[PDB]
């Protein structure tokens with residue numbers, strides 16, 4: 001029945017705004033991803049049957065966590081659509097499709113716990129995956145649903161193209177590890193500064209993609225102020241859960257994860273925009289200037305968080 005889905009006509013335009021909120025369209029979200037794949041990769045880019053199977057199974061394999069759920073895969077999926085539709089002769093076909101898949105899958109089977117939590121308490125996952133722990137998992141989940149029968153959508157294409165869309169997908173998933181993002185954005189800055197970028201350089205494109213993935217991952221902060229505010233509530237409800245179990249293991253969680261410090265959430269929202277969010281969308285704009293609305297909205301929300309703190 002995901003093949004019988006057709007997107008309402010009035011939405012066709014609204015989806016194309018960077019600021020678009022998928023929030024109120026929960027039933028349509030998988031067809032919303034179908035729509036987006038068929039507009040930037042074309043219908044008949046996959047066999048329909050296996051593309052609807054691969055989608056609902058990925059939904060099945062996202063947990064009922066507060067933030068890193070199905071809603072977030074699709075939201076990031078959207079942001080990637082928006083960036084590729086505003087940059088379309090820059091990215092090949094195997095990037096445009098790999099990256100729409102990568103986004104939809106980038107947090108597969110999140111358990112709402114941070115890399116550090118896993119690493120701090122000897123989780124089985126940080127035993128297999130020692131650094132960038134959840135992302136090595138999210139990419140292991142992704143392959144696992146691809147290799148199910150009736151699920152390999154890249155199967156009908158060359159194995160040299162098939163390993164490329166594997167290795168594009170891997171990187172973008174790992175890139176959503178915000179700890180690596182800092183080095184990536186500072187390295188991109190110099191190459192811009194020194195005029196040493198080269199989009200012919202396959203290792204430079206890899207960085208630029210990773211920037212895009214971080215922007216897409218963080219794009220909750222690029223909505224209209226009512227949308228952004230209500231997503232904060234989801235974000236901390238998960239951080240707070242990871243705080244909670246640290247308070248059962250005797251340890252005082254970091255303020256970000258401390259429900260009992262609620263009055264400082266506005267303060268850290270400003271510190272987060274200024275230390276991560278503005279830097280990210282600033283470099284991504286210097287690099288892809290059609291994606292300046294991501295930058296402008298992030299600034300708009302910064303103003304609002306400013307207005308919360310001041311009580312203005």
Ligand SMILES: Cc1ccc2c(c1)nc(/C=C/c1cccc3cccnc13)n2-c1cccc(OCCCN2CCN(C)CC2)c1
Pocket residue numbers: 178179218220221235255256257261264265267268269271272273275
């Ligand atoms: C009371 C309080 C205090 C601090 C809070 C805080 C609340 N909320 C945040 C950040 C909310 C956040 C985190 C991640 C993704 C979002 C997307 C949208 C909105 N928010 C968020 N932070 C915050 C903001 C800025 C900096 C900060 O730095 C801590 C160091 C973390 N760095 C380095 C280590 N890597 C793993 C993560 C980034 C923490």
Ligand SMILES: [Mg+2]
Pocket residue numbers: 106107134135176177
């Ligand atoms: Mg992640």
Ligand SMILES: [Zn+2]
Pocket residue numbers: 072076106107176217
């Ligand atoms: Zn994510």
